[PDB]
Amino acid sequence: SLMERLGGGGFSARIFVGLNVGDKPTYTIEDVVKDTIAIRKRQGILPDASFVAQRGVYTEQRSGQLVTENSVQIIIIDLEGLSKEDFTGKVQALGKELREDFKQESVIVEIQERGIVQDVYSITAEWYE
Amino acid sequence: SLMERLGGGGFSARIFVGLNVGDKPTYTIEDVVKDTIAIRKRQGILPDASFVAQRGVYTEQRSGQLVTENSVQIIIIDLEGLSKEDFTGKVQALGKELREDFKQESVIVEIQERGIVQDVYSITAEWYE
Amino acid sequence: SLMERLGGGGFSARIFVGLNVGDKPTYTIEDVVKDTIAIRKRQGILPDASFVAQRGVYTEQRSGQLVTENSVQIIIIDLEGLSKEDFTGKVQALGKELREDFKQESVIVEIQERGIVQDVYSITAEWYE
Ligand SMILES: Nc1ncnc2c1ncn2[C@@H]1O[C@H](CSCC[C@H](N)C(=O)O)[C@@H](O)[C@H]1O
Ligand SMILES: Nc1ncnc2c1ncn2[C@@H]1O[C@H](CSCC[C@H](N)C(=O)O)[C@@H](O)[C@H]1O
Ligand SMILES: Nc1ncnc2c1ncn2[C@@H]1O[C@H](CSCC[C@H](N)C(=O)O)[C@@H](O)[C@H]1O
């Protein structure tokens, strides 16, 4: 076998997507897998990724209620050697669309370069209050 | 949606908690979720976290027996902008209490700052020998 | 309890192993656990590790087909204080053997030092074309 060293700037990302809508369990990990594939295909990017099922604990921003849900940790290693701006923008757009598609108040996105965190973002719904 | 960049020094932690007591499967991931919520509430800290089910392999320290168990990886991203000392101390106290509550010989704690590991600790029972 | 700070250069690794052979679901996480234990024992290294079940999305290299499979993320924290070369070589050998044992086209290996990625490798089958 060949020991192919990955090129590029070593970008990766983690996205956390919950599966409750409010306090109601609603979605499944496979829903997130399929939606992520669909989004990334429309970006023209290699969709390859890992999806980890989790239990998540989250404090709702508006009410302060503490909720426990199933959630998904999406792990993306850039295998295409994208620029920082290209990779970051495509991951941010994916996170923003996942938030909409799953009716989420927040989606958390973490961008890394050689494992060093460049940015952690909370993508937050602007539902009118 | 709003792309809220997380503030603070970028602290996060990982805690590994096994669910065997010795070679006996005993606990579940939901037990760890509930206990973690309870501990963190008593700390006055936001409990929000992710919990990943795993299979773990561990060599017992006293006997050298190799055990395979279910285990839990707790992932904590600091969203409150705590100081290094505050966050580190609260994570260490959580790990220490989890070790007691689940009758564990070891709990592993990893503290990161912008993804760079600051400390890896094994919290080890002092059972008399 | 004792708060034992881990020594060494802080090496760790992640290995991603799929459970499809081509487009056919074939293996299970427990197969990977058992094979990893067996390999690491023959290396004379402490086998201790964590194994995370995942859903994985992968583009096949030769055909371009997009496949969704179950997969396993192996997380290895070096607790023995190995040298960089020793740890890296033993993780690479484990990844290479896992690729063979599970009839995989690719296995992904990531080596970290204090969380900073030193290398990401794709271990790729040289099946004759
Ligand atoms: N501080 C933190 N550290 C680690 N994981 C966290 C976290 N805050 C949230 N998470 C993870 O992020 C997931 C989604 S956050 C909450 C989503 C919710 N359903 C909504 O509508 O907004 C959680 O389930 C948890 O797995
Ligand atoms: N070197 C290593 N690298 C990665 N994960 C490890 C590890 N050593 C232990 N772990 C993880 O840490 C978990 C708990 S360690 C063993 C706990 C045991 N039940 C006790 O009573 O002490 C394991 O199940 C495994 O998931
Ligand atoms: N770019 C990427 N980012 C994150 N995870 C990835 C990835 N590419 C692959 N993976 C992970 O790596 C696993 C194995 S890669 C594909 C293995 C396949 N069965 C083969 O025979 O080659 C996938 O299931 C996925 O979990």
Side-chain angles (χ1 to χ4, degrees), chain B residues 39-64 66-71:
Chain B
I39 292 163
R40 303 196 82 203
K41 284 174 169 184
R42 292 188 294 267
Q43 296 182 325
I45 196 168
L46 204 71
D48 303 27
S50 296
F51 303 78
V52 177
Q54 318 188 124
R55 295 291 283 164
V57 175
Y58 174 72
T59 299
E60 295 190 347
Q61 297 180 146
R62 292 152 180 81
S63 74
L66 189 69
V67 185
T68 304
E69 59 181 358
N70 294 329
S71 66

Side-chain angles (χ1 to χ4, degrees), chain C residues 1-64 66-128:
Chain C
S1 59
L2 289 177
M3 183 73 32
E4 302 183 359
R5 260 188 185 69
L6 174 55
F11 300 112
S12 66
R14 292 204 293 180
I15 305 176
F16 299 86
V17 185
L19 304 172
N20 269 22
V21 179
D23 63 7
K24 185 175 191 270
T26 300
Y27 300 109
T28 67
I29 180 165
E30 206 69 5
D31 299 335
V32 174
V33 173
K34 291 177 188 291
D35 200 47
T36 298
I37 290 167
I39 292 163
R40 303 196 82 203
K41 284 174 169 184
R42 292 188 294 267
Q43 296 182 325
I45 196 168
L46 204 71
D48 303 27
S50 296
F51 303 78
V52 177
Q54 318 188 124
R55 295 291 283 164
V57 175
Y58 174 72
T59 299
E60 295 190 347
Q61 297 180 146
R62 292 152 180 81
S63 74
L66 189 69
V67 185
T68 304
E69 59 181 358
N70 294 329
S71 66
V72 182
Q73 179 189 161
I74 309 173
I75 303 170
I76 297 166
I77 302 169
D78 178 26
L79 309 174
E80 301 191 277
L82 304 186
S83 71
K84 189 170 198 182
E85 303 281 322
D86 188 14
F87 181 78
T88 294
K90 289 184 183 342
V91 169
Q92 282 171 336
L94 170 60
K96 282 189 160 237
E97 191 63 52
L98 287 167
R99 190 221 53 78
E100 173 183 325
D101 294 0
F102 293 102
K103 300 182 173 187
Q104 298 294 291
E105 184 183 83
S106 302
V107 166
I108 298 168
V109 173
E110 181 186 89
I111 305 295
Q112 294 178 9
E113 182 172 3
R114 303 186 275 287
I116 304 178
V117 175
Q118 303 302 296
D119 323 280
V120 179
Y121 307 102
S122 190
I123 299 173
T124 305
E126 294 178 62
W127 301 329
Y128 188 81

Side-chain angles (χ1 to χ4, degrees), chain A residues 16 20 54 56 58 69 71 104-106 108, chain B residues 50 75 77 79:
Chain A
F16 299 86
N20 269 22
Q54 318 188 124
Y58 174 72
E69 59 181 358
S71 66
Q104 298 294 291
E105 184 183 83
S106 302
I108 298 168
Chain B
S50 296
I75 303 170
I77 302 169
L79 309 174

Side-chain angles (χ1 to χ4, degrees), chain A residues 8 19 23 34 44 51-52 55 60 98 127:
Chain A
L19 304 172
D23 63 7
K34 291 177 188 291
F51 303 78
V52 177
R55 295 291 283 164
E60 295 190 347
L98 287 167
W127 301 329

